[PDB]
């Protein structure tokens, strides 16, 4: 069965505008886990737009198929484009897509893809269906996969006043001993971000609970100005 024509067209059009000179530092930035064509986001967005203008966005029946086929291509720009395309199908994504999103998180995994899946797509789903959080988050924390663990930490990133504080701090407690940079840093990020909404609660938490040095430092990067640094 041939590649979906929309995906074939995108592959052809991206490849015709590849930049091997830029591809080398772009690949180094992601610690050489992926090949790159060398196309940065503004042009990549336009090249996708070109193909949508010519071919139209595929019928929603093929949405998951398109994403998978792009996910399976070697160069990282195709996963970046896949996430752009998923946003165009946003209104069609719901709680039944959580396993599909899980599988994107644990394949071709790195911070660039995972951070574009978790606080937005999964965040929105669990905001609407908070009763489903306990069907997934305990498994993610217990798994060997650091990107599912990072997903558990960051899905509430943008919740602001809708943050479930007890849940957030419980998740962080489960993962606070991790020696993995991407877990320590995710903990720092979500605390720093939530501190923009509720600085008193984050300050109390970090002064009175164990965290990796990196996590605490990142958490209070801004709010330490509000409370001061004791001698």
Partner DNA sequence: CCCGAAAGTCCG
Partner DNA sequence: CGGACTTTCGGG
CA–CA distance, 113 with 111 (Å, rounded to integer):
6
CA–CA distance, 4 with 10 (Å, rounded to integer):
10
Minimum CB–partner distance for residue 153 and DNA (Å):
10
* Contact assessment for residue 74 and residue 41, using Cβ atoms and an 8 Å cutoff: no
Minimum CB–partner distance for residue 15 and DNA (Å):
18
CB nearer to DNA: pick between 58 and 119: 119
CB nearer to DNA: pick between 96 and 208: 208
CB nearer to DNA: pick between 3 and 30: 30
Minimum CB–partner distance for residue 192 and DNA (Å):
5
CA–CA distance, 188 with 94 (Å, rounded to integer):
29
CB nearer to DNA: pick between 5 and 25: 25
CB nearer to DNA: pick between 102 and 218: 218
Query: CA torsion angle for 226, 165, 111, 225 (degrees, to 10)?
Result: 0
Task: Report the interface residues with DNA, using CB under 7 A.
Answer: 28-29, 31, 40-42, 111, 115, 181-182, 185-186, 188-189, 192-193, 213-214, 217-218, 221-222
DSSP secondary structure of 91-113 = GG--GGGHHHHHHHHTSS--HHH
Minimum CB–partner distance for residue 2 and DNA (Å):
30
Minimum CB–partner distance for residue 61 and DNA (Å):
27
Minimum CB–partner distance for residue 5 and DNA (Å):
26
Identify the CA nearest to 12 among candidates 41, 42, 50, 40. Answer: 50
CB nearer to DNA: pick between 123 and 188: 188
Q: What are phi and psi of 170, to 5 degrees?
A: -65, -45
CA–CA distance, 75 with 20 (Å, rounded to integer):
12
Query: CA torsion angle for 130, 134, 139, 142 (degrees, to 10)?
Result: 110
């Amino acid at each position: 069965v041939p590649m979906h024509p929309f995906v074939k067209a995108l592959q052809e059009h991206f490849t015709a505008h590849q930049n091997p000179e830029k591809a080398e530092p772009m690949a180094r930035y992601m610690k050489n886990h992926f090949l790159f064509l060398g196309i940065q986001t503004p042009e990549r967005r336009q090249l996708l737009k070109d193909i949508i203008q010519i071919h139209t966005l595929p019928d929603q029946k093929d949405f998951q198929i398109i994403i998978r086929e792009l996910w399976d291509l070697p160069e990282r720009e195709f996963q970046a484009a896949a996430l752009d395309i998923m946003q165009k199908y946003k209104k069609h994504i719901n709680e039944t897509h959580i396993p599909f999103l899980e599988e994107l998180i644990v394949t071709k995994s790195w911070w660039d893809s995972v951070d574009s899946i978790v606080p937005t797509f999964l965040g929105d789903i669990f905001l609407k269906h908070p009763e489903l959080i306990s069907a997934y988050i305990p498994k993610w924390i217990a798994s060997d996969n650091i990107w599912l663990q990072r997903a558990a930490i960051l899905f509430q990133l943008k919740y602001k006043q809708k943050m479930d504080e007890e849940l957030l701090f419980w998740i962080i407690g489960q993962l606070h001993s991790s020696k993995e940079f991407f877990i320590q840093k995710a903990i720092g990020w979500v605390l720093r971000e939530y501190a923009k909404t509720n600085p008193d609660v984050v300050w109390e938490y970090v002064q009175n609970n164990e965290l990796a040095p990196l996590s605490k430092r990142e958490a209070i990067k801004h709010i330490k100005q509000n409370y001061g640094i004791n001698n």
